[PDB]
Design a protein around this ligand. Structure first.
Ligand SMILES: CCCCCCCCCCCCCCCCCC(=O)OC[C@H](COP(=O)([O-])OCC(O)COP(=O)([O-])OC[C@@H](COC(=O)CCCCCCCCCCCCCCCCC)OC(=O)CCCCCCCCCCCCCCCCC)OC(=O)CCCCCCCCCCCCCCCCC
Ligand SMILES: CCCCCCCCCCCCCCCCCC(=O)OC[C@H](COP(=O)([O-])OCC(O)COP(=O)([O-])OC[C@@H](COC(=O)CCCCCCCCCCCCCCCCC)OC(=O)CCCCCCCCCCCCCCCCC)OC(=O)CCCCCCCCCCCCCCCCC
Ligand SMILES: CCCCCCCCCCCCCCCCCC(=O)OC[C@H](COP(=O)([O-])OCC(O)COP(=O)([O-])OC[C@@H](COC(=O)CCCCCCCCCCCCCCCCC)OC(=O)CCCCCCCCCCCCCCCCC)OC(=O)CCCCCCCCCCCCCCCCC
Ligand SMILES: COC1=C(OC)C(=O)C(C/C=C(\C)CC/C=C(\C)CC/C=C(\C)CC/C=C(\C)CC/C=C(\C)CC/C=C(\C)CC/C=C(\C)CC/C=C(\C)CC/C=C(\C)CCC=C(C)C)=C(C)C1=O
Ligand SMILES: CCCCC/C=C/C/C=C/C/C=C\C/C=C\CCCC(=O)O[C@H](COC(=O)CCCCCCCCCCCCCCCCC)COP(=O)(O)O[C@@H]1[C@H](O)[C@H](O)[C@@H](O)[C@H](O)[C@H]1O
Ligand SMILES: CCCCC/C=C\C/C=C\C/C=C\C/C=C/CCCC(=O)O[C@H](COC(=O)CCCCCCCCCCCCCCCCC)COP(=O)(O)O[C@@H]1[C@H](O)[C@H](O)[C@@H](O)[C@H](O)[C@H]1O
Lengths: 20, 99, 57, 85, 37, 66, 149, 24, 96, 27, 98, 318, 481
């Protein structure tokens, strides 16, 4: 479930990547 | 560019470095013509015996002979080349010392 | 006989449209830029255009 | 700027491997992510060939193109065979 | 050969492709080494 | 050499695995294995020669005591 | 501004791995390839942009669209004016290598395309030709004419 | 599909009338 | 690349043109007057392969004076392997 | 007192094999 | 065009003459650059090639200055593309410098 | 921008090509074509248009507006954007791409999408399988056009279309590679559908073979697309093989040699050839057609790449 | 020259492919099944190559044109390639029953094995990341195809599909490793990559690009050789696919990928920094092999996990970069390959069964007792029973691990090998001394399996009586690297 709970994880990861 | 310079080369006395085709094949010893002939036979036979079951004895024999020609000829070429070049026993230096 | 000219006329006014396709986008580009278009416009020419607009100050 | 064009490819590859891990159930998304990660390494080769100013990158990128394409061909053909009749 | 003519009649486009293509695999094979002069 | 005995076994062992009895002319083709054993021993000699050559090359390498 | 618009590819790649409707998955697949080709254009690799277009969104995602439609899932530069006198188009400077110097890595993808042909044939012939269209293979002398069932 | 394909080979064109050309 | 900007704007201006061609009929005219055909996967995979091999043809086509008679023969070996694949497909009967 | 083609060729090739190989292990 | 401003057109227009003349300066500059590509180490040879070539331009713009103006008009019109006007190229070369 | 100066005249070209086809293909059949509407039917295209525009829909169905109301837009935008790189005269290409030809190849590879999508959004099994068959045909005569372009590319230096038409100053590639022009034309006939090769375009199976929601705009846009794709694929048989904008070079006193007029004359010849060859030949049935793109125009195209590569490598003509 | 083993097996595959396709699609010959006729000529195109390859031993390095561009042959590549062709010879030989008895008219399975063998011949001699990847994917693509071959039984189709997914994803990881390494080094040739990666010391020197690259290459490889933390489908891959294709993609990719690892990881990058992942993989692979073998029933899946565990026992020879370690790894590949060809030859001898477990494997002590003797010999060999060859493999591997100071690696190896010895002794006892269990009867094996099983059974038992040739071969190969 945490592997599916990583939705916001990977999403906000991409966000904090595009911040730079 | 290209160059025939080899690793582990010239372990035996070279006769003609980088032999031209039509010479390295005109150097076939009666053993090479006997290697190119036994390979073509063992390839025609396995090409006929193989095809008796599906009824293709003739054409499977022909394709086994094609495989044998290609393979045994490239083997006779390997031998006569590693002989002309310094790679193999190369007792055919009399052909150079005489001609 | 010149009977085929009636059927040539639509091919003419479809040929008079490719002439316009070719010359419009030529004389429009010949207007925005004082010179015709350069076909073989490799990077040497963009570099020379840069240094050229930098030479005329 | 090379980092921008690489870490973006790196996280496209991470998306591919992520979809691989999650979608072990559905296979068409599996193949989607396979070609995704074979792009994120292909676009990676192209970016690293422009950066290093080296042509081996683009040669390898072209060969990966015409190898991942055959891989997708055989992949989808295997997938169509898997859904037998 | 009889079967060769039977093949260049029944299938003209794969027997005149292996001959409009021989002239391309044959010119650089022999005609180019001939052009040593 | 011992290759002759081994081949007759390989052929007989083969016959024992297909269920067939221990009989035929392939037991006379085990002489080919006798040729094979002689070649394998010949290749052992040639191989230890080449390995000694590579080993003296290594001894020359690895800082050569420095 | 089109430089940072690789975010489009980035989000469309997140779509394909987080989509249950396969049409959206293949659509954003095509989108990922279109934006990757846009990127490969911004880098000046023009040949690879068109090759991405062709052999991805004219062949491979065509395949994937088929698999969806049928079989639904449910300043300071110093430009050196040398080496610019003869600008080598990307195709020319891939061909100067791939076919003469690294040509075996080009004859091996030849074998990989040949294996792909053989594979698509042996897999998806689907018993529709000589693979099984040879015959039902029923012979008379080997039959007992059903007098004794 | 094993259906008989329409083989576009045949015998050459030879106009075949009936035997009543001259004298019935 | 510099010449890619005209087609970059071409895509958008042709989008506009087609949207106008779409909206023109919409405005006027008011109130009163087979399980599976796998051959489409074989044809598709085969086009994929042949367009890959055309992709390999393109650099060899544009750079053939550079690779004098060796690039040509390497491409002819690649093409003989293509031809062996194509003859295996012709004989097996995928072209139907 | 005859045979069929495509098999006498095979027997001649088998003879060529063993005669040829004899010459090989002989040299 | 105008004073001998070494624009793109006027340079690619006289490149034949910049080839016949000013070849020693060009080959010296190239020998330096192929020796070491640091810009400073032959700033002097750069001045030397630029000096003889600006001189060559001011020469070509004295005799046959109208001919050396129509040809650069070409080379600015068609961007340094030779074949597009061989007439101006000939008329300029024929009148004074061959 | 100046994209208007290449889309509007092309729209007029397609609208007048519907009339040019009806009229030429009628003259062939010993009958005057559209001849009452305009002075010589010259207004007949405007009449067809203004009729299709004023035809009330059969069902509004503006709900499904993102699926197949932009797919004809896509097909048409592709058929129109492949016109950028096509040069009408020296320095009249809108955007001289140094890889121009490969870009045309990619535009075709996207037209495949156009057809497949616009056929899948039509929820008609017969029409969808027809669109898939048409896409497989358009893409099977694309390997043959690919190899034909590899031939005309070997003859030329680069893919730059302005160079491919500049590489023919000595002789058009139609004269030495005439057998290739016949294969490019017979492929451009088959890549597009309008040809002896149009079983998916058999008069009835075409209309019921592209979409279910016509509304007229879809019918016109597909035909405007087919006729622009035709003007394009005839503007390629005249860049590559015929001299793109080159005269015969006799340099007449009567002829001041305009370039775009020569390109126009040649593309008119190939459009007239499209029409003539639609009139005089029966359809190929799509089962002999696909067996002509693989078994006939691929071997005869591969041979040509090896022939024009060989004969140009032996004698250093490259 | 220098490509005469490749030039031939590529021409021979074409001669066979055209010969097979023309006949199978022939009305005159009544559409015959060309399998076992393009075979036979297939496996001879192998032996003639193995004769073209073994003979020209000094000639393989005959040009420079290939050296700094494409691929570098040497004594290691030469000996390991004579082995791949020999192990491809066994694998085609054992299939001859699978072609006739099992209804396969698909000859191109043979020509695909031949193209895969050419891809592997180019893997062994691959000496550039690009060539390594291209040959890897050539062989992997032939194997995806011939593993998804059986279209009637859906069990082989989904197995081949997950094999394609696992292999394409492994190749994606390997290729991202190649990208990171190339992108961070600007050099793909192993001769060039070696000069850069001298004194790289990732754990001491900050180089994250090269580190992630070598890590992804190692992960892709450990996927291909189906090591423990990345096997992830390998049991189902070996079980679902047909038996001979399992015998192919289970022994030959191991040999080839392991030779490729010896190339990139002992010459392209040499450091104790990367072999840590292989040390962990060895530990967990021996663990998983032992335990899962203790757990499995299906003989195909039992051999799958046994092969995973033995691949583990291989990597302990790579877990230390000493010549003794590499030579132990090579000894381990030959004694794992010959033993696996034997086990798969046995599993192919029992065609009559469906997917059936060791219980149905029983009664072999009664029906065909010599085959049961051979099977016990092979399973003992895997276990490492002293008087056999697998013992020599595992023992020299453990001795190299001890001489390399990896005492804990030797410890986990010995405990796992003793667990395996117990399990296989118990299996042999259950098969011999009890458990009749339904007496399924078998059609006899053919001469081809018979000689391979017989010669290999002789090799396993009569190995310690003459280990000099193999030890000399592998030590020469290790020195050459
Ligand atoms: C102390 C006393 C000493 C005395 C002196 C000894 C001197 C030598 C002794 C003999 C040496 C070997 C002789 C030749 C090999 C024999 C092979 C064999 O056993 O065949 C079994 C074979 C079993 O199957 P089959 O009955 O053939 O029916 C086929 C099935 O239907 C098959 O199923 P299918 O219907 O599906 O068909 C598929 C087909 C598929 O077939 C294939 O694919 C076959 C491919 C096999 C590989 C290649 C074989 C041919 C070439 C061999 C190598 C030649 C080079 C040298 C050796 C290299 C290494 C082996 O299967 C076949 O079976 C095909 C034919 C099989 C035979 C192939 C080999 C024979 C032809 C070539 C002869 C080569 C001679 C080698 C000599 C060795 C020593 C130097 O039966 C026969 O062949 C019987 C007739 C032939 C033998 C005649 C009698 C022997 C003659 C010599 C005797 C001299 C010694 C006397 C001793 C006295 C005291 C005991
Ligand atoms: C390296 C790469 C090599 C790639 C080339 C392919 C190599 C393998 C070729 C086939 C090998 C044998 C099996 C096929 C049958 C056969 O050839 O003849 C059977 C046939 C069996 O006769 P038989 O039972 O012994 O006695 C006569 C009886 O009347 C009883 O027999 P029959 O007279 O009633 O006839 C039985 C029938 C049995 O077969 C059938 O009836 C089945 C249906 C046949 C349909 C018609 C044949 C279509 C083949 C051509 C396809 C179009 C052209 C493709 C062009 C590709 C690009 C250049 O025979 C045939 O079909 C006639 C021969 C068909 C050969 C097909 C393969 C060769 C064409 C493909 C070439 C590929 C590219 C090569 C490029 C150049 C470099 C190698 O042979 C003969 O009749 C004797 C004449 C044989 C002349 C010598 C040359 C034969 C091989 C031709 C290719 C030469 C190059 C080979 C490679 C060399 C590499 C160094
Ligand atoms: C599939 C694989 C098939 C075999 C591929 C490898 C064959 C390489 C043979 C070679 O290069 O020999 C040149 C060599 C030239 O003479 P030389 O030995 O240097 O010196 C003595 C000469 O008297 C006078 O010699 P020269 O002074 O004229 O020196 C040769 C000369 C001028 O040479 C020539 O003009 C003759 C070239 C002979 C044909 C080589 C290419 C054709 C084979 C591959 C392409 C498909 C088949 C096309 C068949 C067309 C008919 C042959 O050198 C050049 O600068 C031009 C050629 C450069 C080297 C060859 C480039 C192509 C080969 C490399 C790509 C493929 C490698 C195999 C794959 C490796 C990786 C898996 O010998 C020959 O010309 C005959 C060689 C024997 C036949 C070759 C194989 C033919 C296979 C046909 C069926 C294929 C299915
Ligand atoms: C395969 O077989 C087939 C045939 O078989 C012979 C056919 O006939 C055809 C051909 C028939 C068609 C109708 C195809 C579609 C073509 C058209 C509708 C022509 C397109 C025309 C235009 C682009 C023009 C569009 C709009 C116009 C002209 C009007 C816009 C402006 C105004 C209303 C203002 C007008 C006012 C004044 C004063 C003039 C300015 C098809 C398709 C076919 O499939
Ligand atoms: C690295 C190592 C890898 C391991 C694998 C290597 C093997 C590689 C290749 C060879 C693999 C398998 C052997 C294949 C053998 C082979 O085709 O012909 C032999 C001929 O001869 C003997 O039958 C006569 C008896 C032969 C006896 C040979 C003895 C050798 C002993 C070697 C020493 C022991 C091992 C030491 C280590 C067998 O009959 P055959 O095929 O001729 O002909 C027939 C045969 O008669 C059959 O019964 C059938 O009719 C038909 O299928 C067909 O096979
Ligand atoms: C005084 C007492 C001792 C006297 C001497 C005693 C022993 C001498 C030793 C060896 C003799 C030679 C070979 C040993 C025998 C090998 C197996 C020969 C098998 C044989 O007949 O199939 C020939 C092909 O044949 C060769 O493929 C080629 C086989 C060539 C064999 C030629 C033999 C006769 C010529 C003379 C020898 C020449 C070589 C001389 C020097 C070397 C001698 C060894 C084809 O017949 P076929 O169409 O009916 O096919 C057979 C098929 O072969 C069988 O497998 C099937 O079971 C059967 O139903 C049928 O389909």
């Amino acid at each position: 479930g945490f592997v599916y709970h990583y939705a916001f994880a990977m999403l906000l990861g991409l966000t904090l990547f595009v911040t730079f | 560019n290209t160059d025939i310079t080899a690793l582990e080369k010239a372990q035996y006395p070279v006769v003609d470095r980088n032999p031209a085709f039509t010479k390295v094949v005109g150097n076939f010893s009666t053993l090479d013509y006997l290697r190119f002939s036994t390979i073509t036979g063992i390839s025609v036979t396995v090409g006929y015996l193989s095809g008796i079951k599906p009824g293709i004895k003739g054409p499977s024999m022909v394709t086994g002979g094609l495989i044998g020609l290609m393979g045994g000829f490239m083997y006779a070429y390997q031998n006569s080349a590693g002989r002309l070049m310094g790679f193999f026993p190369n007792d055919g230096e009399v052909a150079s010392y005489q001609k | 006989s010149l009977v085929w000219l009636e059927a040539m006329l639509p091919l003419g006014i479809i040929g008079g449209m490719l002439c316009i396709m070719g010359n419009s986008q030529y004389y429009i580009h010949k207007a925005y830029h004082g010179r015709p278009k350069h076909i073989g416009h490799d990077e040497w020419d963009v570099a020379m255009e840069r240094r050229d607009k930098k030479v005329v100050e | 700027d090379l980092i921008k064009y690489f870490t973006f490819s790196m996280i496209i590859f991470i998306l591919g491997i992520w979809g691989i891990l999650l979608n072990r159930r559905n296979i068409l998304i599996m193949l989607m992510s396979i070609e995704l990660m074979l792009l994120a390494v292909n676009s990676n080769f192209l970016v690293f060939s422009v950066s290093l100013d080296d042509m081996m990158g683009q040669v390898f990128a072209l060969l990966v193109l015409t190898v991942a394409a055959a891989e997708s061909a055989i992949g989808l053909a295997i997938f169509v065979i898997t859904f037998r009749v | 050969m009889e079967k060769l003519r039977m093949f260049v009649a029944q299938e003209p486009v794969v027997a005149a492709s292996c001959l409009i293509g021989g002239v391309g695999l044959f010119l650089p094979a022999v005609v180019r080494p001939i052009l040593d002069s | 050499m011992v290759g002759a005995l081994l081949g007759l076994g390989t052929q007989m062992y083969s016959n024992a695995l297909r269920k067939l009895p221990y009989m035929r002319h392939p037991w006379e083709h085990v002489v080919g294995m006798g040729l094979g054993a002689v070649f394998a021993n010949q290749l052992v000699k040639w191989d230890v020669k080449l390995k000694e050559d590579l080993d003296v090359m290594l001894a020359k390498a690895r800082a050569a005591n420095e | 501004i089109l430089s940072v618009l690789s975010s489009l590819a980035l989000v469309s790649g997140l779509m394909v791995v987080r989509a249950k409707n396969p049409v959206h998955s293949v659509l954003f697949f095509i989108l990922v390839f279109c934006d990757t080709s846009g990127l490969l254009l911004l880098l000046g690799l023009d040949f690879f942009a068109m090759i991405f277009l062709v052999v991805y969104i004219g062949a491979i995602a065509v395949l994937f669209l088929f698999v969806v439609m049928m079989f639904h899932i449910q300043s300071l530069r110093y430009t050196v004016y040398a080496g610019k006198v003869r600008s080598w188009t990307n195709l020319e400077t891939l061909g100067n290598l791939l076919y003469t110097y690294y040509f075996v890595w080009f004859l091996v993808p030849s074998l990989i395309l040949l294996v792909a042909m053989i594979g698509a044939i042996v897999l998806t012939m689907h018993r529709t030709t000589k693979v099984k269209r040879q015959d039902v293979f029923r012979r008379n002398a080997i039959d007992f004419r059903r007098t004794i069932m | 599909a094993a259906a008989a394909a329409a083989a576009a080979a045949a015998a050459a064109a030879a106009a075949a009338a009936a035997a009543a050309a001259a004298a019935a | 690349m510099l010449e890619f900007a005209p087609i970059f704007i071409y895509l958008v201006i042709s989008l506009l043109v087609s949207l106008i061609l779409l909206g023109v009929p919409f405005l006027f005219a008011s109130n009163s007057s087979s399980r599976f055909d796998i051959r489409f996967y074989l044809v598709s995979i085969l086009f994929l392969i042949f367009d890959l091999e055309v992709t390999f043809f393109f650099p060899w086509a544009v750079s053939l004076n550079k690779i004098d008679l060796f690039g040509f023969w390497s491409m002819m070996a690649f093409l003989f392997i293509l031809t062996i694949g194509f003859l295996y497909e012709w004989k097996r009967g995928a072209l139907d | 007192v005859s045979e069929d083609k495509n098999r006498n060729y095979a027997v001649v090739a088998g003879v060529v094999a063993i005669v040829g190989s004899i010459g090989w292990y002989l040299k | 065009t105008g004073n001998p401003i070494p624009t793109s057109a006027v340079l690619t227009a006289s490149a034949k003459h910049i080839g016949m003349r000013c070849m020693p300066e060009n080959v010296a500059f190239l020998k330096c650059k192929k020796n070491d590509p640091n810009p400073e180490k032959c700033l002097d040879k750069g001045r030397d090639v630029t000096r003889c070539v600006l001189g060559l331009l001011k020469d070509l713009h004295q005799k046959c200055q109208k001919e050396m103006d129509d040809y650069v008009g070409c080379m600015y019109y068609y961007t340094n593309e030779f074949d597009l006007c061989r007439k101006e190229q000939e008329a300029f070369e024929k009148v004074c410098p061959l | 921008a100046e994209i208007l100066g290449i889309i509007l005249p092309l729209l007029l070209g397609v609208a007048f090509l519907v009339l040019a086809e009806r009229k030429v293909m009628a003259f062939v059949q010993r009958r005057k074509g559209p001849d009452v509407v305009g002075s010589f039917g010259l207004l007949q295209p405007l009449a067809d248009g203004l009729k299709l525009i004023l035809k009330e829909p059969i069902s509004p169905s503006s709900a499904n507006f993102f699926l197949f109301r932009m797919a004809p837009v896509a097909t048409f935008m592709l058929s129109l954007v492949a016109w950028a790189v096509v040069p009408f005269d020296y320095g009249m290409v809108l955007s001289d791409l140094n890889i121009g030809l490969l870009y045309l190849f990619a535009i075709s590879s996207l037209g495949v999408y156009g057809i497949i999508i616009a056929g899948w959004s039509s929820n008609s099994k017969y029409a969808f399988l027809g669109a898939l068959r048409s896409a497989a045909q358009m893409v099977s005569y694309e390997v043959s056009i690919g190899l034909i372009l590899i031939t005309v590319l070997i003859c030329v230096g680069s893919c730059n279309l302005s160079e491919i038409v500049m590489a023919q100053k000595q002789i058009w590639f139609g004269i030495p590679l005439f057998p290739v022009l016949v294969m490019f034309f017979i492929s451009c006939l088959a890549e597009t559908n309008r040809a002896p090769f149009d079983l998916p375009e058999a008069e009835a199976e075409l209309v019921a073979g592209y979409n279910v929601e016509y509304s007229s705009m879809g019918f016109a846009l597909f035909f405007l697309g087919e006729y622009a794709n035709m003007i394009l694929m005839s503007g390629l048989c005249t860049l590559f093989f015929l001299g793109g904008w080159l005269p015969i070079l006799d340099l007449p006193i009567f002829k001041k040699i305009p370039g775009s007029i020569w390109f126009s004359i040649k593309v008119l010849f190939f459009l007239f050839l499209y029409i003539w060859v639609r009139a005089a030949f029966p359809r190929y049935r799509y089962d002999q057609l696909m067996g002509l793109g693989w078994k006939v125009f691929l071997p005869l195209s591969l041979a040509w790449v090896v022939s024009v590569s060989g004969l140009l490598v032996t004698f250093q003509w490259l | 020259l220098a490509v005469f083993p490749e030039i031939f097996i590529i021409n021979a595959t074409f001669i066979l492919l055209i010969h097979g396709v023309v006949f199978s699609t022939s009305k005159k010959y009544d559409y015959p099944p060309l399998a076992s006729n393009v075979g036979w000529l297939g496996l001879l195109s192998v032996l003639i190559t193995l004769l073209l390859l073994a003979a020209g031993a000094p000639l393989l390095t005959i040009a420079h044109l290939f050296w700094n561009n494409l691929f570098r042959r040497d004594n290691f590549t030469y000996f390991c390639q004579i082995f791949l062709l020999l192990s491809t010879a066994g694998t085609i030989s054992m299939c001859f029953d699978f072609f006739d008895q099992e209804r396969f008219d698909a000859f191109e399975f043979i020509v695909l094995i031949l193209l895969s063998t050419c891809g592997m011949l180019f893997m062994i001699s691959a000496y550039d990341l690009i060539a390594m990847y291209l040959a890897i994917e050539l062989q992997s693509l032939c194997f995806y195809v011939i593993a998804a071959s059986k279209r009637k039984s859906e069990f082989s189709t989904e197995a081949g599909l997950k094999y394609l997914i696992l292999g394409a994803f492994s190749s994606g990881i390997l290729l991202f490793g190649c990208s990171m390494i190339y992108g961070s080094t600007g050099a793909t040739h192993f001769d060039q990559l070696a000069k850069i990666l001298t004194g790289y010391e990732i754990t001491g020197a900050r180089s994250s690009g090269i580190f992630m690259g070598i890590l992804f290459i190692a992960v892709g490889f450990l996927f291909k050789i189906t090591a423990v933390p990345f096997h992830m489908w390998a049991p189902d891959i070996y079980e679902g696919s047909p038996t001979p294709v399992t015998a192919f993609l289970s022994i030959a990719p191991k040999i080839s990928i392991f030779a490729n690892i010896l190339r990139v990881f002992i010459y392209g990058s040499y450091g104790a920094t990367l072999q840590q992942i292989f040390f962990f993989c060895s530990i967990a692979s021996m663990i998983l092999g032992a335990l899962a073998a203790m757990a499995q029933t299906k003989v195909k899946r039992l051999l799958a996990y046994s092969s995973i565990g033995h691949v583990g026992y291989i990597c302990i020879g790579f877990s230390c970069g000493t010549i003794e370690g590499i030579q132990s790894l090579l000894i381990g590949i030959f004694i794992y390959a010959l033993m696996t060809m034997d086990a798969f030859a046995i599993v192919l001898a029992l065609r009559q069964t469906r997917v059936k477990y060791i219980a149905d494997l029983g009664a072999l002590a009664k029906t065909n007792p010599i085959l049961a003797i051979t099977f016990s010999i092979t399973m003992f060999s895997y276990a490492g029973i002293p008087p056999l060859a697998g013992f020599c493999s595992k023992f020299y591997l453990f001795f190299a691990a001890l001489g390399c100071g990896a005492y804990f690696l030797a410890l986990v190896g010995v405990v796992t090998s003793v667990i395996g010895c117990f399990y296989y002794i118990r299996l042999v006892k259950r098969m011999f001394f009890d458990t009749p269990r339904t007496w399924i009867l078998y059609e006899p094996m053919d001469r081809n399996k018979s000689l391979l099983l017989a010669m290999t059974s002789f090799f396993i038992t009569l190995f310690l009586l003459y280990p000099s040739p193999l030890f000399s071969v592998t030590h020469q190969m290790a020195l050459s690297l």
